[model samples]
Target: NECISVKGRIYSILKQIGSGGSSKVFQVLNEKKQIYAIKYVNLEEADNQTLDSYRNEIAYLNKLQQHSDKIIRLYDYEITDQYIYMVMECGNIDLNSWLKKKKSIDPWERKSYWKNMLEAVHTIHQHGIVHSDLKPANFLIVDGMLKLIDFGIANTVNYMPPEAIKDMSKISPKSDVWSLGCILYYMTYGKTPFQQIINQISKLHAIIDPNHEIEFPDIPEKDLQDVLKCCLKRDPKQRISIPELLAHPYVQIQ
Candidate 1:
């Protein structure tokens, strides 16, 4: 019976809901019978990189959630000598798991999910933030809406942009757009652009290769394919900006 306390209130930890890197998230129940998710990390076991990312995740969520409901909400956070706790909104499932369970999605429902992702990404861009890591796993389905989570600097290889694969410091807002393209590819085709490649170095080489062009499978919603092309451009400057992406024909279609 694991229990965590925040601000004089105690929450009963029901089960572990999520985990990544050095942190684990648990589904917790409050006194009011409300359900929440709490992220736990051990300070003593944390490296400098892990410690910095926890600080950044907290700060970014606090600022981003105020402007857009697409971002996950942070209810409360506490820091002790040995551990850190972040009590936050709970989600039913992450997009990665959701996508795996579905063989195919209805056209209308697919459009809705696509729009939700754009809205989430657009919010961060509007706030002068570049979400270096944008992947299916980073999005959670909360009450049927896609809520973006995890503001860590860690990048998912399959979703990384060309410039980012070549050099980490080259990332900008356009870099996020490139990652969004990969996510869309996943939603439509059930696989990222480079997901089929086995070797890590081979995948990196493929991503950074200027001569390489992403294959756009002829799928339903031609406009969506066009949007993917706009997003997967090799040159960051050539990629569509966030505002432009929101106004694109694919986003407005349905």
Candidate 2:
């Protein structure tokens, strides 16, 4: 069996856990039987921006993890000539796959998960970090607890606000709020707010166009509806603050 040697520590790759356009994550076990997740990016395959973003993700993960358990903890990292391996806390499943396992989550369970999501983002936002890409996939279930992961792509346009979509420089904590709203919308409706638009350009246009308003269904919970409305606003200035979201009656529901 092949093993990875990082920082003089040997870890046997147990199985593949996740993969993306530029990287792959594996479940690994060290000689001490300690389990960890290691993500590796092929330096030759990655562009300059992608490498920079990977470094950025590692930097934030290392820094923010000390402050909140909601953020994924980075244990170690090594940059070799061919690849960059990031060792982090292992997770059971991502929120997206968990959602796919069932059509409807328990009402109370959903509330709890929703709160966890807010808490995770709240922690990062409080630290002046904008998780520019907030989505179901970016959140992982660690020991049955939801924690945030993945911070490389800072220009995820689908979850972006109107202003940020128009100007990438406008991406801010408010952009994370809009992305959270999209996640909330996905949780409630099983689809993103703008999933209907298949074309990339068209989707961006729909997101930024003032004439097209976000459609809300007849959800029974008004508090949830209010929270969604506040989050999906076109203007960043009008979006709900993290504190407000954390305190909202819906999220506060036990």
Clashes of each: 0, 0
lDDT of 1 by residue, 1-254 (tens): 68989978899999997557667899999999999999887788767777777677677788886788888888988987688898889999998998889897777776787788888888877777788777889899999888888754431589988877677468899988888888878878878999888898989999988777778879768898898889888888888888898898887856
Query: For every candidate structure, what is the RMSD over all alpha carbons to the true structure, in angstroms?
Result: 2.2, 2.6
Worst 10 residues of 2 by lDDT: 151-160
Off by over 4 Å in 2: 19-22, 44-52, 153-158
Clashes of 1: 0
Model 2 alpha-carbon miss at residue 49, Å: 5.4
TM-score of 1: 0.91
How do all models score by TM-score?
0.91, 0.87
Best by lDDT: 1
lDDT of 2 by residue, 119-228 (tens): 88888777677767677889998887788886634313567667666775678788888888888877787778898888888899999888988889878888888988
**Global lDDT scores for all candidate models:** 0.83, 0.81
